[PDB]
Amino acid sequence: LDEHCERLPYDASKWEFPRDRLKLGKPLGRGAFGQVIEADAFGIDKTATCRTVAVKMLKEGATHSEHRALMSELKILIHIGHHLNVVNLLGACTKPGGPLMVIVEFCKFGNLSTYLRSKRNEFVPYKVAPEDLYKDFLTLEHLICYSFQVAKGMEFLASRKCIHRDLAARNILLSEKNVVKICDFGLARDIYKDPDYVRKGDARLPLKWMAPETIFDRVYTIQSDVWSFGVLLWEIFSLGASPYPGVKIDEEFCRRLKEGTRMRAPDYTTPEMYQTMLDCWHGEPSQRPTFSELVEHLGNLLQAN
Numbered sequence: 001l002d003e004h005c006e007r008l009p010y011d012a013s014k015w016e017f018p019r020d021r022l023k024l025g026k027p028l029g030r031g032a033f034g035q036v037i038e039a040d041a042f043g044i045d046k047t048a049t050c051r052t053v054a055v056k057m058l059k060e061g062a063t064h065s066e067h068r069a070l071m072s073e074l075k076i077l078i079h080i081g082h083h084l085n086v087v088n089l090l091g092a093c094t095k096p097g098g099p100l101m102v103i104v105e106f107c108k109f110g111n112l113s114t115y116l117r118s119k120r121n122e123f124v125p126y127k128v129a130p131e132d133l134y135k136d137f138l139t140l141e142h143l144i145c146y147s148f149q150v151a152k153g154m155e156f157l158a159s160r161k162c163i164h165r166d167l168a169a170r171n172i173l174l175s176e177k178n179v180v181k182i183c184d185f186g187l188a189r190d191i192y193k194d195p196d197y198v199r200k201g202d203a204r205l206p207l208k209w210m211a212p213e214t215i216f217d218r219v220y221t222i223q224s225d226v227w228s229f230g231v232l233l234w235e236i237f238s239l240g241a242s243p244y245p246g247v248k249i250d251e252e253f254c255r256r257l258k259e260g261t262r263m264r265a266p267d268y269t270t271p272e273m274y275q276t277m278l279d280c281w282h283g284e285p286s287q288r289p290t291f292s293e294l295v296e297h298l299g300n301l302l303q304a305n
Ligand SMILES: COc1ccc2c(Oc3cnc(CC(=O)Nc4cc(C)cc(CN(C)C)c4)c(OC)c3)ccnc2c1
Pocket: 002, 028, 029, 036, 054, 055, 056, 073, 076, 077, 080, 086, 087, 102, 103, 104, 105, 106, 107, 108, 109, 110, 111, 163, 164, 165, 173, 182, 183, 184, 185, 186
């Protein structure tokens, strides 16, 4: 349903937030044409309550085309609606005289790739030592829990007839109480400057996260997002490492992948989590697990761990 966004509704009476009730702060993420800014919103979700929020908007260099793209993103966020594991839309500023602003809840710890890399040294598979009890360490349970939550969020997106197209740990945010939310920086990331995006024709694409059918056939489905989810699992259980370490991402990488070449197990995986990565990476899209099956499986692993 996310291919024809322009026909989706924008109910101003529900979503419109006055620009003067927003106290704009520091940048959280900046692209070439878009940006994400921290802000204090007055009474956006609870009467007369200040709330820290994240605001997506355009910047110098953007054109009317990026403005139309941002409005489509607002419409799809409305269609998607709320779930614990998706960043929740809180409001928007669309009235003339100011920039189009898309306001979502704030996720204090930022993107999951940077977070896990920063916390790599503070990881223990199992907190079992009596002295280690009051140490805020990441454990296997936390990693499986983040994995399970992203699958729940993706299952939810799928139920809304939407697909992600850029699922990766950089598009996962961490909030308080170990809650992770799916986001999509999009224009608020500078893909022409970001090494995760590689020139493949006239577009800069996240090649290391793409299914062979996306690279070779330009096919995007929920099952290609499952492939991306497998790559995300590898990022989680490598504690924020970059995929395919030491591999030049060229025509040869793409052919080897298309032929069945896969990544080796990351350093912090359990045998079952690596098997789950291999299952998401099945060459045949229909043979990959679905998000509903991944939710059930990860929920089982979380209960077994
Ligand atoms: C502390 O540092 C930080 C740093 C960054 C933060 C943050 O960044 C944002 C990231 N992305 C967006 C846009 C977005 O998520 N759009 C979107 C969401 C879904 C579920 C689906 C689709 C549709 N597509 C096709 C899949 C689009 C933001 O909008 C305001 C903010 C949010 C909160 N807190 C943040 C804290």
